[PDB]
């Protein structure tokens, strides 16, 4: 019953061959297999992977009943290499059968899958609720997760309302500290690269609408390539749809990967950057959110995107990523001229490598517990308390101190005597059921405390008062983990 690392993919291949949708995933695993195997052996030599319980894990892919398919494939691969006993489900019948047999210790599921879980198991679905890890790309903020609070704020979305611990939501990028970051793995260079080759990001013609001036400025200094036909200028060199090795060859050859504004926060810009490409990242001013952008309306989050790829913008930056105003002709020309003169430096954040994803998912499996049976994680030693100004979120004040909001610490910040420790003295206090508390009015020294523990929230700025904010440190290249979290 102890987990043993796997160094051979034969059994995995056999399991994924049972569902047609895994076909192009198996190809990707074969291409990446040597990287995965070096990674699990390297992790096991560097960190104690001994004496882990082998878990029976349900993976229910609601969406099989894309970036999402890449994330599923990397999660399943990581679980397999770490030695866990994986039961894959892509039907209501498999789901019923796996849960029928009992002994399930951990459940990875998507939003569509979760509705199927509740319907198929009936009222005892809640018995398993603490074992759920819900793959949810764009994230779920606490305000939308709390069904009754969402109704009371007049949100009309069908999404959210699961009443989970919001750290059970697993995101594509570390954009929502209320949630956990799952992510995925990103699959002489002077000689290989065509210095004046740009490639447009966007496999559909619709994405190209109103980018003519932008594309013309790039075309002044570079060839414009595409992999896509009304909106496409005559000078564009279309290679058609590519795949695997061919696309990787094209990226290896490309100096500049050109964002058009859509799609939002995909894997492709990280793949370009890993291959030595610079990424021209459209800036969004004002930021795009469920409040101003049709695509985002109904998403169970108010999170604002400052660019097409906020992760690339904030966690990578120049020289790999140039975040520019598409409508600023001077800034676009300067960016393109600078990129042309840049030395090529292929870059991959550690959190998007095989080893970094294995380390992250291994820490969540071993340490993240909503079922009440394990010591506090992250450990309390990691708490650094910060006061957010009015109009600033807990997410914002941690980030501006090179930290990350840690929602599991909110419970240690929620009464008069606990505040004393953090040089805040409450002359008076009350309880509110609000995402914006605990709060502090520094004028009249009035503290408002959280009356509904499900409403603790890294998201949300108080218009008038300071917020009392739980921050933690993170390992550079591994934002999901605090220094003492391994």
Swiss-Prot record:
GO terms for biological process: positive regulation of cell migration; positive regulation of receptor signaling pathway via STAT; protein N-linked glycosylation; protein N-linked glycosylation via asparagine; viral protein processing. Glycans are attached at residue 196. Changing residue 187 to A: Decreased catalytic activity. Residues 51-56 are annotated as: Important for activity in FGF2 release. One of its GO terms (molecular function) is alpha-1,6-mannosylglycoprotein 6-beta-N-acetylglucosaminyltransferase activity. GO terms for cellular component: extracellular exosome; Golgi apparatus; Golgi membrane; membrane. Signal peptide: none annotated. The keyword Oxidoreductase does not apply. Its EC number is 2.4.1.155. Induction: Induced by IFNG treatment in monocytes (in vitro). Disulfide bonds join 130-371, 394-469, 398-471, 405-458, 426-447, 482-485. Residues 1-486 are annotated as: Sufficient for catalytic activity. Substrate binds at residues 136-137, 299. Pathway: Protein modification; protein glycosylation. UDP-N-acetyl-alpha-D-glucosamine binds at residue 271. Residues 1-486 are lumenal. It catalyses: N(4)-{beta-D-GlcNAc-(1->2)-[beta-D-GlcNAc-(1->4)]-alpha-D-Man-(1->3)-[beta-D-GlcNAc-(1->2)-alpha-D-Man-(1->6)]-beta-D-Man-(1->4)-beta-D-GlcNAc-(1->4)-beta-D-GlcNAc}-L-asparaginyl-[protein] + UDP-N-acetyl-alpha-D-glucosamine = N(4)-{beta-D-GlcNAc-(1->2)-[beta-D-GlcNAc-(1->4)]-alpha-D-Man-(1->3)-[beta-D-GlcNAc-(1->2)-[beta-D-GlcNAc-(1->6)]-alpha-D-Man-(1->6)]-beta-D-Man-(1->4)-beta-D-GlcNAc-(1->4)-beta-D-GlcNAc}-L-asparaginyl-[protein] + UDP + H(+). Keywords: Disulfide bond, Glycoprotein, Glycosyltransferase, Golgi apparatus, Membrane, Secreted, Signal-anchor, Transferase, Transmembrane, Transmembrane helix. Activity is increased by Mn(2+) and Mg(2+). Optimum pH is 6.5. Belongs to the glycosyltransferase 18 family. This is Alpha-1,6-mannosylglycoprotein 6-beta-N-acetylglucosaminyltransferase A. It comes from Homo sapiens (Human). The gene is MGAT5.
